[PDB]
């Protein structure tokens, strides 16, 4: 039941959201990063300074070596390993066990994060972007093929963990309307942004710029990442709105903290960002609104805990727009693979203060009939 699946995610700020999984027979328990931005299932399989535990293939009598190596370079972080298959379950997910491809990570560089409490990654996107190539069936494809669980999952990520509901939509997790944007191509979860506003002010760019060279929904990525030209415009606009206070250059590069005395964070001086997503109907769109409570990410370090400190969680990208965790937080996001669309609604843990609230609103109509896809 979906009720059993609620609150099955945990996480630390800036360190992803993970779900408990078991691999092998007898089951070995691991925490696994939920990542809609990749398509490989991979687990630590040898000692590493940042690993609390790892997958021991020799103790699983159901493990099969595929006799193939694999290497995955992310934007930040990389690992290499050996491919195999084994039995996998999700204790607080569907009540099924399936045989899936698993990469056993034997060497890595800046992949594992000290203290994150996860030991592997679950790539939930499509085979087209799997390594070594698209012939390696991703986990979710295996799950659907072997169990006839409906071809859909949803994520409710909550900020300072959340729920991954497999096989359907849990209405207890959102309010208001669920708005759908088409998946443009089944590789990443690619979507189209048709308009961007900062505090109600249109950035006024050709809408193709927002999607150079793609826009994706990516739960494994912390920040909102924007194409260079869009990032520069966004920062200028956010700077203009918050000009009553000055921040270090390092802050806007996402590197340095800004801190305020406990409870005094001036949320009002920071603008709301509206991302308008292509709708299911021609030239219609809906917007999701992003508050500073989302794009100023709280740090949870005990050493900094006397005050409220934040990192600027918007970053420049060279590989397109990435709608990462800080964007997904507070929304219920439905990955409706069966109907090739992604849904957004305000979730039960949506961000708000007395003046403003995260929202999903539509429909909006645009006069210009240009296709915003970069292609």
Catalytic machinery residues: 35, 218
Buried b or exposed e, range 130-149, using 16+ CB within 10 angstroms: bbeeeebbbbbbbbbeeeeb
Our finding on whether 33 is near ligand BXD (CB under 6 A) is yes
CB closer to ligand BXD out of 77 and 298? 77
Our finding on whether 75 is near ligand BXD (CB under 6 A) is yes
End-to-end CA distance of the chain: 40
The region of 24-32, 69-77, 84-92, 154-162 touching ligand BXD under the rule CB under 6 A is: 69-77
Interface pattern 87-126 for ligand BXD (x via CB under 6 A): ------------------------x-x--x----------
Our finding on whether 74 is near ligand BXD (CB under 6 A) is yes
CB 192 within 8 A of CB 215: yes
Nearest distance in Å: CB 29, ligand BXD: 19
CB closer to ligand BXD out of 22 and 38? 38
Interface pattern 221-250 for ligand BXD (x via CB under 6 A): xx----------------------------
Rounded Cα distance, 128 and 146, in Å: 20
The region of 50-58, 207-215, 219-227, 348-356 touching ligand BXD under the rule CB under 6 A is: 219-227
CB closer to ligand BXD out of 55 and 286? 55
3-state secondary structure the chain: CHHHHCCCEEECCCCCEEEEEEECCCCEEEEEEEECCCCCEEEECCCCCCCCCCCCHHHCCCCEEEEEEEEEECCCCEEEEEEEEEEEECCCCCCCEEEEEEEEEEEEECCCCCCCCCCEEEECCCHHHCCCCCCCCCHHHHHHHHHCCCCCEEEEECCCCEEEEECCCCHHHEEEEEEEEECCCECCEEECEEEEEECCEECCCCHHHHHCCCEEECCCCCCEEEEHHHHHHHHHHHHHHCCCCCCCHHHHCCCCCEEECCCCCCHHHCCCEEEEEECCCCCEEEEEEECHHHHEEECCCHHHCCCEEEEECEEEECCCEEECHHHHCCEEEEEEHHHCEEEEEEECCCCECCCCECEEEEEEECCCCCCCCCC
Our finding on whether 220 is near ligand BXD (CB under 6 A) is yes
Our finding on whether 86 is near ligand BXD (CB under 6 A) is no
Our finding on whether 254 is near ligand BXD (CB under 6 A) is no
CB closer to ligand BXD out of 81 and 220? 220
Q: Which of 86, 218, 329, 336 binds ligand BXD (CB under 6 A)?
A: 218
Nearest distance in Å: CB 37, ligand BXD: 3
Our finding on whether 38 is near ligand BXD (CB under 6 A) is yes
The residue nearest ligand BXD at its CB is 77
Site for ligand BXD, residues 123 to 142, rule: CB under 6 A:
129
The region of 67-75, 160-168, 233-241, 248-256 touching ligand BXD under the rule CB under 6 A is: 67-75
CB closer to ligand BXD out of 75 and 357? 75
Q: Which of 45, 72, 100, 226 binds ligand BXD (CB under 6 A)?
A: 72
Q: Which of 9, 13, 21, 37 binds ligand BXD (CB under 6 A)?
A: 37
Residues at the site binding ligand BXD, with contacts judged by CB under 6 A: 15-16, 33, 35, 37-38, 72-77, 111, 113, 116, 129, 218, 220-222
């Amino acid at each position: 039941s979906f009720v059993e699946m609620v609150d099955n995610l945990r996480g630390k700020s800036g360190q992803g959201y993970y779900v408990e999984m078991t691999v092998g027979s007898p089951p070995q328990t691991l925490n696994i990063l939920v990542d809609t931005g990749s398509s490989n299932f991979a687990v630590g399989a040898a000692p590493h300074p940042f690993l609390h535990r790892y997958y021991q293939r020799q103790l699983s009598s159901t493990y099969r070596d595929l006799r193939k190596g694999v290497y995955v370079p992310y934007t930040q972080g990389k690992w290499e390993g050996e491919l195999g298959t084994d039995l996998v379950s999700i204790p607080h997910g569907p009540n099924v066990t399936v045989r899936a491809n698993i990469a056993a990570i034997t060497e890595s560089d800046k992949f594992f994060i000290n203290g994150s409490n996860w030991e592997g990654i679950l790539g939930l996107a499509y085979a087209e972007i799997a390594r070594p190539d698209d012939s390696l069936e991703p986990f979710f494809d295996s799950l659907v093929k072997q169990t006839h669980v409906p071809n859909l999952f949803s994520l409710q990520l909550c900020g300072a963990g959340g729920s991954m509901i497999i096989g359907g939509i849990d209405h207890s997790l959102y309010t208001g309307s669920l708005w759908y944007t088409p998946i443009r191509r089944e590789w990443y979860y690619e979507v189209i942004i048709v308009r961007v506003e900062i505090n109600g002010q249109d950035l006024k760019m050709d809408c193709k710029e927002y999607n150079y060279d793609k826009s994706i929904v990516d739960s494994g990525t912390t920040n909102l990442r924007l194409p260079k030209k869009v990032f520069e415009a966004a920062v200028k606009s956010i700077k203009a709105a918050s000009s009553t206070e000055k921040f270090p250059d390092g802050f806007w590069l996402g590197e340095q903290l800004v801190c305020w005395q406990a409870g005094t964070t001036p949320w009002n001086i920071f603008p709301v960002i509206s991302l308008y997503l292509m709708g299911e109907v021609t030239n219609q769109s809906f917007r999701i609104t992003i508050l500073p409570q989302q794009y100023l990410r709280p740090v949870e370090d005990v050493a900094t805990s006397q005050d409220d400190c934040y990192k600027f969680a918007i970053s420049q990208s060279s590989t397109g727009t990435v709608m990462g965790a800080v964007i997904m937080e507070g929304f219920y996001v439905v990955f409706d693979r069966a109907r090739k669309r992604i849904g957004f609604a305000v979730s039960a843990c949506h961000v708000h203060d007395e003046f403003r609230t995260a929202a999903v609103e539509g429909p909006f109509v645009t006069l210009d009939m240009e296709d915003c896809g970069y292609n």
